[PDB]
Design a protein around this nucleic acid. Structure first.
Ligand SMILES: Nc1ncnc2c1ncn2[C@@H]1O[C@H](CSCC[C@H](N)C(=O)O)[C@@H](O)[C@H]1O
Length: 332
RNA sequence: GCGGUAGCUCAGCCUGGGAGAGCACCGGACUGAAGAUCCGGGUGUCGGGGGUUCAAAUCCCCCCCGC
């Protein structure tokens, strides 16, 4: 808590000098008069070593909204070590609050609302289980609801996280798939959920996309999502309520197939059977098996009489040494 | 009348002086369950131009783009 006195004509030069060495105090705020300007500094010793006049005065603390804080900043060391990455989906804030530390859950709550004020629901995070891949979520703060509208890559996505699968992070993958698509192709997305992949693909390109999903409430909020985005999309989307393994054999074929396969499911043969130009097949593979995974894909390609180039890439960390991966199959 | 800030979603603007958050993305680590977790990295024309000022993301004017 101390300051720098500089002539107003030199105020800017001193300012960026202090930035250059790095002793300007961002927590406080600078006072000025017609004669001089005072800048708060972190260390006076290097201020005088640079040869500046150093003064001790009370400078106003800045509003907290203007102080750069992270989630580690506002939490004791121990329970931050225990946490617990934060993910925000619309109005819901989802975090993994470990079981040892739930008393500081309430302290945790404050931090999140100090970090994100516009969020109305804070929920504790479990795992994905069952066959709709719904994740275990319980609300530790706020409005007792698990549904909200979420913005991603320019689209609106209605999600009730207690009845459907949705992961915000896959936004990255979605944009990238959206970029591989070319205008005019017909695309099939099995296991489409609340159609985030359709909505993003059609958001950035003029295509027709078929979406197949089995969860009836997921098709409900896919409907509502398409209504929500009707004036936003360049392409067209059609939603099919059904089982992929029953629905797909009766559909026509598609330029590109994007299969976010559910954990444990083998849809490689079917989805590849419905593709002529591109298949993007997601799977869960341990690192040391990744190359074998590729051979499996190549095997299936030649079982269908297709000539393909196959490249598999890591998409995300699923569990220790296991990655969510995608096989890009280019059919010739 | 509002809104345009990192790749996405957004704080910061009232009342001028640190380019920030979460996630994405890149690199690395981690044996049973895990759509995880750990460590490192900011990748920016604050839509653009002008004005006031020692100094503009912030205040004023004009232009562009979407409700
Ligand atoms: N046999 C089947 N037919 C159609 N959909 C299925 C299915 N088995 C599971 N699903 C659905 O496929 C989804 C897998 S997770 C959803 C992924 C979605 N594309 C997204 O990125 O959000 C789940 O919603 C699940 O309900």
């Amino acid at each position: 808590m101390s300051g720098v006195k500089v002539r107003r004509e030199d105020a800017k030069k001193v300012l960026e000098l202090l930035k250059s060495v790095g002793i300007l105090d961002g927590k406080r705020k600078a006072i000025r008069d017609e004669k001089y300007v005072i800048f708060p500094v972190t260390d006076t010793n290097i201020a005088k070593s640079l040869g500046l006049e150093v003064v001790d005065v009370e400078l106003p603390m800045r509003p907290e909204r203007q102080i750069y804080k992270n989630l580690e900043d506002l939490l004791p060391r121990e329970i931050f070590k225990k946490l617990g990455r934060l993910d925000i989906v619309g109005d819901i804030a989802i975090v993994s609050i470990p079981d040892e530390i739930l008393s500081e859950r309430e302290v945790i709550v404050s931090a999140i609302r100090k970090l994100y004020p516009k969020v109305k629901v804070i929920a504790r995070r479990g795992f994905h289980s069952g066959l709709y891949r719904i994740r275990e979520l319980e609300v530790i703060w706020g409005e007792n609801r698990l549904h909200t509208i979420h913005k991603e890559n320019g689209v609106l996505i209605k999600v009730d996280l207690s009845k459907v699968f949705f992961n915000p992070r896959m936004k990255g993958e979605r944009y990238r798939i959206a970029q591989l698509v070319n205008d005019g192709e017909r695309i099939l997305v099995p296991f489409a959920g609340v159609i985030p992949y359709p909505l993003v693909i059609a958001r950035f390109k003029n295509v027709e996309v078929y979406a197949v999903e089995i969860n009836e409430f997921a098709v409900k909020l896919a409907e509502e999502n398409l209504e929500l985005n009707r004036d936003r999309l360049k392409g067209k989307i059609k939603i099919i309520h059904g089982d992929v393994f029953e629905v797909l054999p009766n559909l026509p074929n598609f330029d590109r197939v994007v299969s976010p396969t559910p954990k444990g499911v083998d849809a490689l043969s079917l989805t590849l059977s419905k593709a002529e130009k591109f298949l993007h097949y997601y799977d869960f593979v341990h690192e040391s098996e990744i190359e074998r995974f590729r051979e499996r894909v190549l095997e299936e390609c030649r079982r269908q009489g297709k000539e393909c180039r196959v490249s598999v890439r890591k998409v995300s960390d699923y569990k220790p040494h296991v990655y969510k991966v995608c096989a890009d199959v280019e059919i010739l």
